[PDB]
């Protein structure tokens, strides 16, 4: 009954700048309103509790204001340990409810990614399927467009894809996407291409290999 | 210490039931309100019920209310939560939760469990079918080249990828699993290397999948062309 709204979805801030998280009620949430900080394969971390309460251990970087409807929580220096997911949670109505979560992710400089196709191999064929597999390897920001092109015909539900989480080191994402195809209509076709367009590449690159053809 | 402990997860099939157990390690657990809290795979944070300190009172999220029961019992000194017709959007992470008091409700949830995985599916326990990404699919020459594994068509809870038994961890990019429409499971795993190693240096991807008990060790070469 009571939605939450988290602004903005994804935040790219440097190590060591002030990052502020919005947190929105559609009523009035007075006091009953929590904020807590999830990283990939951890449990929930609560933050602040009654809007402005630090819990056990929270480092005084992290800080929560607001009243009513409209909640901010502030981390006044970004260590590279706040990069994580934050999460502002309601206990004033009925159904005690999330707002969709606002990442927070380190800004880098614009990395092209570097880019890959695998065709299937004979093993896979064998089996009756097809996967052809186009890799964009180390690219920041997050944003990029793949597009599979089969004898030049633009693909559409028949791939899947996958990213991998900001790197430790260099904060950059690499992504994989499979075409999944049935070996008899991978036999009908001769060019499988995939076409990548980022923000570091000044035009779209495309990867193709033919049928057969090694 | 104080800790939370959650057990009772596994695979259970859509339209069946399953039943989550809570254990509370160095706490009271009769003077706290209970919660569970899920995460499905890709989505965030949902609050799933809670029982009050009391045991008077329950609440539950609009998306389980009707189907899941959250029970205490402080005989067993034990949290429970009774899932039933299960569907496949009920496939997340659990974690058991302890309240913070609070006027009327709670200020916060403070406590947390490591988190337990239901995967609501009709699939058939099966282990993957390994294939190889070989390098240089057009040049080699200068530097820098990819090859990986196609670790396909499989289902369990999860995979552990490895290349050359960990002696090999730089550049390696393991990627989150798809659910594909099959209803098993399939990713990639990929490392980028020095071209001029190709010839020499042997890269083995170790495919371990516990929940068949299947262990692959697939060696990925540039495929021979005549």
């Known amino acids: 009954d009571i939605v939450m709204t988290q602004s903005p979805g994804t935040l790219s801030l440097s190590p060591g700048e002030r990052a502020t998280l919005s947190c929105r009620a559609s009523?009035?949430?007075?006091?009953?309103l929590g904020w807590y900080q999830h990283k990939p394969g951890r449990s929930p971390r609560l933050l602040i509790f009654?809007?402005?309460s630090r819990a056990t251990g929270v480092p005084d970087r992290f800080s929560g204001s607001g009243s009513g409807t409209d909640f901010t929580l502030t981390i006044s220096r970004l260590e590279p340990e706040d990069f994580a997911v934050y999460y502002c949670?309601?206990?004033?109505?009925?159904?005690?409810?999330f707002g969709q979560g606002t990442k927070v992710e380190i800004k880098r400089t614009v990395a092209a990614p570097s880019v890959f196709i695998f065709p299937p191999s004979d093993e896979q064929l064998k089996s009756g399927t097809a996967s052809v597999v186009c890799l964009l390897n180390n690219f920041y920001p997050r944003e990029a467009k793949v597009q599979w092109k089969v004898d030049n015909a633009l693909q559409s539900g028949n791939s899947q894809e996958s990213v991998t989480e900001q790197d430790s080191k260099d904060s950059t994402y690499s992504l994989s996407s499979t075409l999944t195809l049935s070996k008899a209509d991978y036999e009908k076709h001769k060019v499988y291409a995939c076409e990548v367009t980022h923000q570091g590449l000044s035009s779209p690159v495309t990867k193709s290999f033919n049928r057969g053809e090694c | 210490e104080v800790q939370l402990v959650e057990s009772g997860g596994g695979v259970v099939q859509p339209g069946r039931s399953l039943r989550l157990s809570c254990a509370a390690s160095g706490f009271s657990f009769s003077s706290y309100g209970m919660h569970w809290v899920r995460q499905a795979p890709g989505k965030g944070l949902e609050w799933v019920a809670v029982?009050?300190?009391?045991?008077?009172?329950?609440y539950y999220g609009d998306s389980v209310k009707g189907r899941f029961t959250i029970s205490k019992d402080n005989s067993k000194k034990m949290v429970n939560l009774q899932m039933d017709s299960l569907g496949v959007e009920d496939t997340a992470f659990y974690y058991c939760?302890?309240?913070?008091?609070?006027?009327?409700?709670?200020?916060?949830?403070?406590?947390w469990g490591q988190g337990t995985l239901v995967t609501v599916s009709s699939a058939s326990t099966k282990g993957p079918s390994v294939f190889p990404l070989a390098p240089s699919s057009k040049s080699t020459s200068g530097g820098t080249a990819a090859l990986g594994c196609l670790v396909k068509d499989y289902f369990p809870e999860p995979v552990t990828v490895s290349w050359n038994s960990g002696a090999l961890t730089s550049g390696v990019h393991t990627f989150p699993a798809v659910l594909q429409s099959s209803g098993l499971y399939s990713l990639s795993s990929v490392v980028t290397v020095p071209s001029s190693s190709l010839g020499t240096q042997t890269y083995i991807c170790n495919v371990n999948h516990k929940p068949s008990n299947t262990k692959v060790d697939k060696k990925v070469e540039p495929k021979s062309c005549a």
């Open positions: 949670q309601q206990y004033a109505g009925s159904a005690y409810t």
């Open positions: 009523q009035n949430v007075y006091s009953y």
């Open positions: 939760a302890r309240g913070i008091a609070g006027g009327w409700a709670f200020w916060g949830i403070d406590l």
């Open positions: 029982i009050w300190y009391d045991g008077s009172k329950t």
């Open positions: 009654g809007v402005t």
